[PDB]
Amino acid sequence: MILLEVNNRIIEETLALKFENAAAGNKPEAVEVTFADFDGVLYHISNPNGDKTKVMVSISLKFYKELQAHGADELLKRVYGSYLVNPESGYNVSLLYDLENLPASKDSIVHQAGMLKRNCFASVFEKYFQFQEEGKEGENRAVIHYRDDETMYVESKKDRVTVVFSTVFKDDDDVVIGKVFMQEFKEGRRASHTAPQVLFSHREPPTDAAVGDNIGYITFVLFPRHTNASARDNTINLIHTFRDYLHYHIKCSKAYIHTRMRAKTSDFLKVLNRARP
Amino acid sequence: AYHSFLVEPISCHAWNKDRTQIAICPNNHEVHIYEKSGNKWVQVHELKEHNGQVTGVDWAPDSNRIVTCGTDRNAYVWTLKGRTWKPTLVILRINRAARCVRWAPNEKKFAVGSGSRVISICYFEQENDWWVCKHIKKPIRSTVLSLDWHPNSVLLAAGSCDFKCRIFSAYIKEVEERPAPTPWGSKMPFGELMFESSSSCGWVHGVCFSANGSRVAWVSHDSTVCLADADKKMAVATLASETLPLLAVTFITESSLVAAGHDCFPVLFTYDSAAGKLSFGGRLDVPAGLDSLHKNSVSQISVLSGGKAKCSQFCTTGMDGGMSIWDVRSLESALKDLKIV
């Protein structure tokens, strides 16, 4: 697995099981699940008021207010429609599924529920992709604090749209491994000329943008071929999962180093014990 | 002629009078006595009394008694009662491990060098039925590593970690009588310092007195071998080796020494009295992954026959668990270039 999946398995599997037993005509079991996603996202699936014929899927994002200022509520209605209900206390968005009134093809809605987090993010990109798509410049930049100490910055311009990530490497050595990965992004064009141009700035930001030894600023430059209405979605899927993608790979690298060390160490021990009469 | 008794170190060994039994310490608190049956080695006895590793063993030839000393601070004189060896505790009055032990030729007393920076001279008193000891302290400043008695059973050579080789008087009038003058001196009251090497380098791993005892040789950690000639105002000859430190040494004639150490093979050194110089007589072991018989440091060497005056066969035991017997005459054939004495 190189790319992180965009949907959420627990949502899809929880909903799929309920829908199946509902169609089969079995009596509805009670369900109560609390789980998370990357970026401090919290979910809750439950039976509102204890009505076992109703399954609610709620999401909590500390940074929702900010996405709301950039079209979230509007996008969510567009996407989910009647499935939306007033947000459960403690969450920003709620989906309500009536187990006694499901659609012919359940896959579509399971697939959409599975993408709740993604659809809460899409809005900000779609907005600014539109500003550019209409020459509209000068428009303020979106400032999304997707993590307690990390920030994303979207901004539109005449020809391009730029996304800037301000990420933090808690682990001092993770910064170093990070630079290696970032260096390769800054050159990925040498393998795809028409792909987003990535820029990277270590300690220094490219505002009150924090400056520290463990901070890094990645910058994707999206062009119409990425921001248009035909590529848009795919582009959103990638771009919004980027930060976790990078950290996931910094961590998997450390794991690979470990396998190399286990092997090397093992070799060392075999030699040492061959020195025994 | 190598034999492997085990693959862990042989801490120390001692042969009986006829060289028919060898006592070894297989790197533990016990002493195993082996004997040959045809051409096989058979274990005939196991001496278990010490509570720490045995660091020194000596067998008094005529009285057939074995003395052992260990890190447990003790020393036991072993007596053969029919078919079993019985130990008799000997209080050394020390609070650190005993490191070495040698019976005096007259078998009237033995010496124990220890980590209490002192030599314990023990002897039995047929009045109270037990062993007693007197210490030789000054000017010893560190652990005593090796001991070797003079043929007169009074003078004692000592090697220690304070980098010195010394000759003392272990004269106990209560078991022997006034010693005859020696070129080393005419005054030998107990504990008298008769001679002290002049060097500040290397622990003295081994000491040895010549057949007539007018010469004493020793090997140190600085990879040097020395010999002090008492017939020459105690002049000291010195040879700096190009190899690793030697751990054991012995005269095989009045002017020839055989030593072995970390290189794992015995080598020859000769002394030129007129010149007063020592020379390197060459390796005697001529051909794991070593070309030497022993596979680890050789730590003890002894004369099996011919004595120090005209040794015909010598023995070596090392940290590799092996025991070797070397025939001098045979070595003289296989190496026409070898010049002894």
Binding site: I2, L3, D173, V180, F181, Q183, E184, F185, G188, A191, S192, A195, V198, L222, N234, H249, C252, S253, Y256, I257, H258, R260, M261, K264, T265, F268, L269, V271, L272, A275, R276, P277 | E8, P9, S11, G52, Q53, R96, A97, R99, G115, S116, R117, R141, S142, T143, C161, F163, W203, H221, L244, P245, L247, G261, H262, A288, L290, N296, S297, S299
Partner: protein, 166 residues
């Protein structure tokens, strides 16, 4: 170019240093300790020596009557080689017990240290221990290099895989 000469000087010194014997403590009744660690009896310690290949790479050899401490300053050309080296020396020190000759922590100023005792030179052929330390110095450099390439290799595939999808 300068490697072989370096390792050769190092091996000779290890040969000189690994000449140990059992030694019961002169200080504590019935105790036995590596003198190079405790250092409570000066006459038992040998002159510390160093073998340097250049301003960064070097080896410190500290002998005593019953033990030697061998510290190595490893080559670390850049940040990435530095963290990899550091993670690798840590990985081994955590498993120090399986090694028996590895020190749990390095001597101040070095990346990794060995503590070879008389008990080791008895249970293992000393000439092979000298052979091991040398084999060790050579193989860690190779390992740090491979890891480095491994990192740059996955790094590139990861960036191209992500970028190629836009």
């Amino acid at each position: 170019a300068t490697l072989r000469p370096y390792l050769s000087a190092v091996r000779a010194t290890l040969q000189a240093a690994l000449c140990l014997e059992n030694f019961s403590s002169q200080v504590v009744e019935r105790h036995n300790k590596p003198e190079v660690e405790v250092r409570s009896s000066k006459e038992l310690l040998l002159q510390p020596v160093t073998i340097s290949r250049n301003e960064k790479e070097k080896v410190l050899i500290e002998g005593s009557i019953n033990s030697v401490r061998v510290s190595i300053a490893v080559k670390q050309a850049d940040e990435i080689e530095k963290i990899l080296c550091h993670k690798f020396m840590r990985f081994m020190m955590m498993r120090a017990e399986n090694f028996f000759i590895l020190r749990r922590k390095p001597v101040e100023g070095y990346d990794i240290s060995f503590l070879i005792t008389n008990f080791h030179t008895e249970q293992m052929y000393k000439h092979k221990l000298v052979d091991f330390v040398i084999h060790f110095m050579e193989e860690i450099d190779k390992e740090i290099s491979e890891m480095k390439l491994s990192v740059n290799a996955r790094a590139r595939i990861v960036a191209e895989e992500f970028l190629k999808n836009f």
